[PDB]
Write an enzyme that holds these catalytic residues in place. Sequence first.
Site, PDB file in Angstrom:
ATOM      1  N   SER A  43     -11.351   4.182   1.194  1.00  0.00           N
ATOM      2  CA  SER A  43     -10.997   3.277   2.267  1.00  0.00           C
ATOM      3  C   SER A  43     -10.961   3.969   3.616  1.00  0.00           C
ATOM      4  O   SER A  43     -11.133   3.325   4.650  1.00  0.00           O
ATOM      5  CB  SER A  43      -9.621   2.677   1.983  1.00  0.00           C
ATOM      6  OG  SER A  43      -9.664   1.700   0.969  1.00  0.00           O
ATOM      7  N   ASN A  71     -11.894   4.395  -5.593  1.00  0.00           N
ATOM      8  CA  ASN A  71     -11.075   5.575  -5.844  1.00  0.00           C
ATOM      9  C   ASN A  71     -10.813   5.798  -7.316  1.00  0.00           C
ATOM     10  O   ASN A  71      -9.723   6.210  -7.717  1.00  0.00           O
ATOM     11  CB  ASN A  71      -9.758   5.461  -5.090  1.00  0.00           C
ATOM     12  CG  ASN A  71      -9.930   5.249  -3.611  1.00  0.00           C
ATOM     13  OD1 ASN A  71     -10.984   5.543  -3.036  1.00  0.00           O
ATOM     14  ND2 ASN A  71      -8.910   4.671  -2.986  1.00  0.00           N
ATOM     15  N   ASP A 113      -9.721  -6.513   5.928  1.00  0.00           N
ATOM     16  CA  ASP A 113      -8.681  -5.696   5.307  1.00  0.00           C
ATOM     17  C   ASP A 113      -7.342  -6.413   5.345  1.00  0.00           C
ATOM     18  O   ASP A 113      -7.310  -7.639   5.250  1.00  0.00           O
ATOM     19  CB  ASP A 113      -8.639  -4.352   6.017  1.00  0.00           C
ATOM     20  CG  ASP A 113      -8.128  -3.246   5.157  1.00  0.00           C
ATOM     21  OD1 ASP A 113      -8.950  -2.350   4.840  1.00  0.00           O
ATOM     22  OD2 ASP A 113      -6.937  -3.269   4.799  1.00  0.00           O
ATOM     23  N   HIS A 131      -2.686  -0.637   5.929  1.00  0.00           N
ATOM     24  CA  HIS A 131      -3.993  -0.178   5.504  1.00  0.00           C
ATOM     25  C   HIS A 131      -5.072  -0.599   6.497  1.00  0.00           C
ATOM     26  O   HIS A 131      -5.898   0.212   6.910  1.00  0.00           O
ATOM     27  CB  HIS A 131      -4.278  -0.721   4.116  1.00  0.00           C
ATOM     28  CG  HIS A 131      -5.530  -0.202   3.501  1.00  0.00           C
ATOM     29  ND1 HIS A 131      -6.708  -0.907   3.536  1.00  0.00           N
ATOM     30  CD2 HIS A 131      -5.775   0.914   2.767  1.00  0.00           C
ATOM     31  CE1 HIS A 131      -7.634  -0.240   2.868  1.00  0.00           C
ATOM     32  NE2 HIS A 131      -7.097   0.873   2.400  1.00  0.00           N
TER      33      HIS A 131
END
Length: 279
Positions: A224, A161, A39, A69
Amino acid sequence: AAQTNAPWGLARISSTSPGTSTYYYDESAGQGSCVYVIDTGIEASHPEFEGRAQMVKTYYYSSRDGNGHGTHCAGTVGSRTYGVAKKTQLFGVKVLDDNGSGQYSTIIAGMDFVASDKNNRNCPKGVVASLSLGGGYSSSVNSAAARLQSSGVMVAVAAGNNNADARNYSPASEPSVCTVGASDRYDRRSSFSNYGSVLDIFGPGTDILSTWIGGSTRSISGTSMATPHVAGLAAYLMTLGKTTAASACRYIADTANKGDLSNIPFGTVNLLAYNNYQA
Ligand SMILES: [Ca+2]
Ligand SMILES: [Ca+2]
């Protein structure tokens, strides 16, 4: 063990029903497992990681998570307060820049890195990789995720998403990994969650409280956020010896809460990650 007033997602994965507040989990808590969070990095100094997080690779100038994130996702895997697997070891692989973007070549390299690096780590209960990222379909990205899974790592990836079929996104569309859709606290598919035949499982993804950079916390939404619930659950179950990296996704699907979700299109699994904890 029981964590009272837990984030709803943690309560949800330890309940057959929505709306509970306690996260019930075996105290082994993923001890002896390792989860690579591929990530934006992990702010390993966050107190919530209790020294159990470390950066192991960056593809940028710094290993610092300048975005948040990755830290958030890592916190859902394994932070004390926000994590599914509260005693797992967390390894950060920074494939995403501080804007949260990364080139596919870098993401692929990061997956290949984990497949090799795990051989240098003491992870007696097994290795998981959490990939809360994705873009358009790429056979090479999918192949890298397949390789990582083949190497003996439980790969969990975000469905995406796009409120669309995950078949057009990668690594979501790679069949051999665990493709995770997002649900909300009312057991609806998250409005943004991708769907489709390639999804293996849903996890909590709307309004997920976790760690953030600057030693902070925040609630964000995405597939996520669902992905690390599943990665953490895998680590937890692997520590319990209930499953292995190769079979964990199937085991999670087989033991999931079935049919609890709404707004699931025909052809998409209606399965919500569940730890089946019994005190
Ligand atoms: Ca139920
Ligand atoms: Ca799959």
